[PDB]
Design a protein around this ligand. Sequence first.
Ligand SMILES: *[C@@H]1O[C@H](CO[C@@H]2O[C@@H](C)[C@@H](O)[C@@H](O)[C@@H]2O)[C@@H](O[C@@H]2O[C@H](CO)[C@@H](O[C@@H]3O[C@H](CO)[C@@H](O)[C@H](O)[C@@H]3O)[C@H](O)[C@H]2NC(C)=O)[C@H](O)[C@H]1NC(C)=O
Ligand SMILES: *[C@@H]1O[C@H](CO[C@@H]2O[C@@H](C)[C@@H](O)[C@@H](O)[C@@H]2O)[C@@H](O[C@@H]2O[C@H](CO)[C@@H](O[C@@H]3O[C@H](CO)[C@@H](O)[C@H](O)[C@@H]3O)[C@H](O)[C@H]2NC(C)=O)[C@H](O)[C@H]1NC(C)=O
Ligand SMILES: *[C@@H]1O[C@H](CO[C@@H]2O[C@@H](C)[C@@H](O)[C@@H](O)[C@@H]2O)[C@@H](O[C@@H]2O[C@H](CO)[C@@H](O[C@@H]3O[C@H](CO)[C@@H](O)[C@H](O)[C@@H]3O)[C@H](O)[C@H]2NC(C)=O)[C@H](O)[C@H]1NC(C)=O
Ligand SMILES: *[C@@H]1O[C@H](CO[C@@H]2O[C@@H](C)[C@@H](O)[C@@H](O)[C@@H]2O)[C@@H](O[C@@H]2O[C@H](CO)[C@@H](O[C@@H]3O[C@H](CO)[C@@H](O)[C@H](O)[C@@H]3O)[C@H](O)[C@H]2NC(C)=O)[C@H](O)[C@H]1NC(C)=O
Lengths: 220, 220
Amino acid sequence: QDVRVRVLPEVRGRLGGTVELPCHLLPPTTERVSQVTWQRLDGTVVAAFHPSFGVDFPNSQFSKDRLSFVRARPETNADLRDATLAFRGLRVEDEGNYTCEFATFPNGTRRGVTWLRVIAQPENHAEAQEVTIGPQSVAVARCVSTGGRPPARITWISSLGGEAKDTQEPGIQAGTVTIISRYSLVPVGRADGVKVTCRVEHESFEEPILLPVTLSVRYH
Amino acid sequence: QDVRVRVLPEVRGRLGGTVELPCHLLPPTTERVSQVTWQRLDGTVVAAFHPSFGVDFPNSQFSKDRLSFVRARPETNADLRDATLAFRGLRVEDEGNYTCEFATFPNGTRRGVTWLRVIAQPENHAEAQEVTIGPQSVAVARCVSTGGRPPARITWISSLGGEAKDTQEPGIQAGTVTIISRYSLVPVGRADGVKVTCRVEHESFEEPILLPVTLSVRYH
Ligand SMILES: *[C@@H]1O[C@H](CO[C@@H]2O[C@@H](C)[C@@H](O)[C@@H](O)[C@@H]2O)[C@@H](O[C@@H]2O[C@H](CO)[C@@H](O[C@@H]3O[C@H](CO)[C@@H](O)[C@H](O)[C@@H]3O)[C@H](O)[C@H]2NC(C)=O)[C@H](O)[C@H]1NC(C)=O
Ligand SMILES: *[C@@H]1O[C@H](CO[C@@H]2O[C@@H](C)[C@@H](O)[C@@H](O)[C@@H]2O)[C@@H](O[C@@H]2O[C@H](CO)[C@@H](O[C@@H]3O[C@H](CO)[C@@H](O)[C@H](O)[C@@H]3O)[C@H](O)[C@H]2NC(C)=O)[C@H](O)[C@H]1NC(C)=O
Ligand SMILES: *[C@@H]1O[C@H](CO[C@@H]2O[C@@H](C)[C@@H](O)[C@@H](O)[C@@H]2O)[C@@H](O[C@@H]2O[C@H](CO)[C@@H](O[C@@H]3O[C@H](CO)[C@@H](O)[C@H](O)[C@@H]3O)[C@H](O)[C@H]2NC(C)=O)[C@H](O)[C@H]1NC(C)=O
Ligand SMILES: *[C@@H]1O[C@H](CO[C@@H]2O[C@@H](C)[C@@H](O)[C@@H](O)[C@@H]2O)[C@@H](O[C@@H]2O[C@H](CO)[C@@H](O[C@@H]3O[C@H](CO)[C@@H](O)[C@H](O)[C@@H]3O)[C@H](O)[C@H]2NC(C)=O)[C@H](O)[C@H]1NC(C)=O
């Protein structure tokens, strides 16, 4: 894990979206570059670049349709020190640790490693459930952050001191998860009409999203 | 530590002598080779080979005077899969773990690692010390394996049950060690003329070397 190879430790990309993973051999340019290879941790080579032999993306799983080098030079940069790797149509399966390796000469190989995270932005909905008075604590409201990656975090902003209950469950999409949160309390008459807000946090949002809902109690 | 790179785990060479360290990328030949580099563990590159840029031995310590590739081809083998590295004028300082690395394309780098040991063959001498009768246990014989690497192992084959004492000490040559072994016993009259043998074992010898000596006691 060499300082003269510059990369970013972490990099995030939207499910089914695109990311560039940057990688550079930092100058001074005091060594020739022999070839560049992007490997996964398993060892599996993802993309490879060679000044004579050209480019290759030998894994059927990370094919040329999705992977590409950003390198822009007109077929002939006096040296290929920028090794930046673009992904498209991101898969959950691409979440991984990628390793950018420069075979230099006569200096040996230098590498840098970047963690690619695939985020999925969930879909959010809340509602009140209409309830009758009674001593049993029932769900008076629910909030659901569907198909998040990673799992979203729901909390309840309410003036009444009702217990929250939540649970996980698999998302529709491979490696997404839906979070279900139920707001329960003993239904009391003064509660009718009171706004109770669902507060859902997730990587993909600038900040917590708020889904306000108004409670509904029997016999106003 | 890849199976498709063939090397030898261990390799021994005489101080101030020569060794070849062999290294091959095993066929089938299903990948192009980009460049070959021999690194020490520290990382320090010892020798490097590149099909276009040529050869280099960039470390002042392992210079071209001593290092060389055995590779024989007339400047143009269709591929340079044999990466065998010759050393000469071996130094104690070269004892190390060397790593043979093939930058392949598009396949990544494969490597193999060989431990290079520098042996020094010691010089051996033994003698009896002449002694007078007396209750005090004195050295009646000594044996010295001078300037060994690694340290030699001396033992005594004798019919009399005398205690052995030995000690280390630095050798003349950097990273050699002299072993001194004294054969002591209470000098008894029947012992005169009795052969007592020095038995010294060391890597460099086919087997244990034997230095026989005849005891010398006062008043036969
Ligand atoms: C470098 O990678 C190449 C190609 O790798 C192939 O595809 C990638 C997406 C990955 O899935 C790789 O795992 C995959 O191999 C390798 O070439 C292949 O080498 C192997 C031998 O190591 C060949 O298998 C042999 O097949 C023959 C008969 O066809 C048998 O007789 C052998 O016993 C053996 O099973 C394979 O056919 C070959 N592929 C091609 C297109 O030639 C290469 O081995 C690898 N090299 C290194 C050093 O990693
Ligand atoms: C991708 O790689 C990153 C970072 O690199 C990590 O370090 C490397 C040098 C290797 O040794 C890798 O094995 C290692 O993953 C990973 O981030 C790290 O993930 C590990 C899980 O394997 C986390 O370890 C935890 O550490 C805490 C203490 O803080 C313990 O309580 C746990 O038991 C657990 O061991 C670690 O927190 C995390 N580090 C950072 C900075 O996020 C990553 O997991 C791996 N993932 C992917 C998707 O590629
Ligand atoms: C690959 O190795 C080359 C040459 O390495 C040199 O000799 C070997 C036997 C080893 O002892 C190496 O450690 C040694 O560097 C490296 O080239 C050298 O790069 C450094 C910068 O990393 C240069 O030092 C700079 O010097 C200038 C002024 O001269 C300062 O302004 C800088 O602040 C810095 O100190 C050094 O001069 C340069 N040598 C040559 C001949 O150009 C190279 O860095 C290295 N590359 C990698 C990726 O490892
Ligand atoms: C050169 O390298 C060899 C072999 O490779 C070794 O394994 C590598 C994968 C790395 O992890 C290296 O760190 C490691 O050296 C070395 O041979 C081994 O040396 C180590 C000392 O570092 C020995 O370890 C001992 O193990 C015993 C238990 O059996 C313990 O009681 C000791 O505490 C000690 O840790 C090990 O015996 C030895 N292995 C063999 C097969 O000989 C070598 O030391 C290193 N030396 C040189 C000159 O390059």
